[PDB]
């Protein structure tokens, strides 16, 4: 899935819009009504640590 989302940067007073591919198994819908508005599966239980 070619996902796009807003993100922060080094400058706390500025933000950026990026995109990246994500496997369907690593994404879960938020409301199941719009089709978009996807969320990372682990977001509602803990924050994963990047290896």
């Amino acid at each position, epitope marked *: 899935k070619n996902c*796009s989302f807003n993100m922060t940067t080094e400058l706390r007073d*500025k*933000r*950026q*819009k*990026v995109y990246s591919l994500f496997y369907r198994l690593d994404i879960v819908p938020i409301n199941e009504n719009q089709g978009s508005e996807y969320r990372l599966i682990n977001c509602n239980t803990s924050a994963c640590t990047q290896a």
Partner: antibody, heavy 132, light 107 residues
Framework: EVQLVESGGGLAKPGGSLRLSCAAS????????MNWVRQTPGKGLEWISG????????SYADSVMGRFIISRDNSKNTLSLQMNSLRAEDTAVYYC?????????????????????????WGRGVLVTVSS | DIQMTQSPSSLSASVGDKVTITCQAS??????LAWYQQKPGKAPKPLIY???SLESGVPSRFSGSGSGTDFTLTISSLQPEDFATYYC?????????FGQGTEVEIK
């Protein structure tokens, strides 16, 4: 290739109302800003409105501030511009244009701000005129 | 607000002759200025996006330069299919003012 066309324009009366529409295809309409410009007969062109990819932070020119309202629908991949209290001087071939670079990248508050743009692709403008 | 000035208003040409359209700016805009042309009955098209960068698809013949208020376009009329208005539009400003347009044709 990118295909952009607009319709809805036509004969209207002074002080009335009208609505313009612009359809897009061949590209991600939800990742490109849209601006409206007019080409009056004889003299040069002129920019009159602009909207971001998200549909907010609508900008207009002093000559159409408060009369023309811009709007877009990312779901339908279309753009619109509501006309209210139009006058005789507002006769022109309103052109539907799209910016060159997408809104991806750094930004201050609006996703596409902080980046410079220029009207790259232009649609087949529609003429609008009003007379007694 | 900021407004542009384009010159010459109109001029004659031929095939092979080099014409140069140049436009001035009241305020400094560094290099954020694009050039355009429009055939009769056709929508405007882009030719130069930056003050000195060429647009994809257009022939390598076209060129032009300038910075600050001064800017210029470089033509050699090697073709008979460039005879129409050549607009000078600046950006990096709220109004995005356009130029008065310049018409060029064969004698």
């Amino acid at each position: 290739e990118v295909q952009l066309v607009e319709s809805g324009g036509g004969l209207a009366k002074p002080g009335g109302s009208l609505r313009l529409s612009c359809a897009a295809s061949g590209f991600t309409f939800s990742n490109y800003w849209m601006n409206w410009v007019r080409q009056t007969p004889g003299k040069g062109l002129e920019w009159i409105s602009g909207i971001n990819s998200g549909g907010g932070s609508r900008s207009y020119a002093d000559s159409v501030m408060g009369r023309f309202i811009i709007s877009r629908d990312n779901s339908k991949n279309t753009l619109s511009l509501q006309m209210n209290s139009l006058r005789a001087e507002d006769t022109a071939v309103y052109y539907c244009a799209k910016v060159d670079d997408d809104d991806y990248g750094y930004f201050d508050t609006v996703p596409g701000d902080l980046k410079k743009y220029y009207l790259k692709y232009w649609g087949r403008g529609v003429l609008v005129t009003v007379s007694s | 607000d900021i407004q542009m000035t384009q010159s010459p208003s109109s001029l004659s040409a031929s095939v092979g002759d080099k014409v140069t359209i140049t436009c001035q700016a009241s305020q400094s805009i560094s290099s954020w200025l694009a050039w355009y042309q429009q055939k009769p009955g056709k929508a405007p098209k882009p030719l130069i996006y930056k003050a000195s960068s060429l647009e994809s698809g257009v022939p390598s013949r076209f060129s032009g330069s300038g910075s600050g208020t001064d800017f210029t376009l470089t033509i050699s009329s090697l073709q008979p299919e460039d005879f129409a208005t050549y607009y000078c539009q600046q950006y990096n400003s709220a109004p995005f003012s356009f130029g008065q347009g310049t018409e060029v044709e064969i004698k």
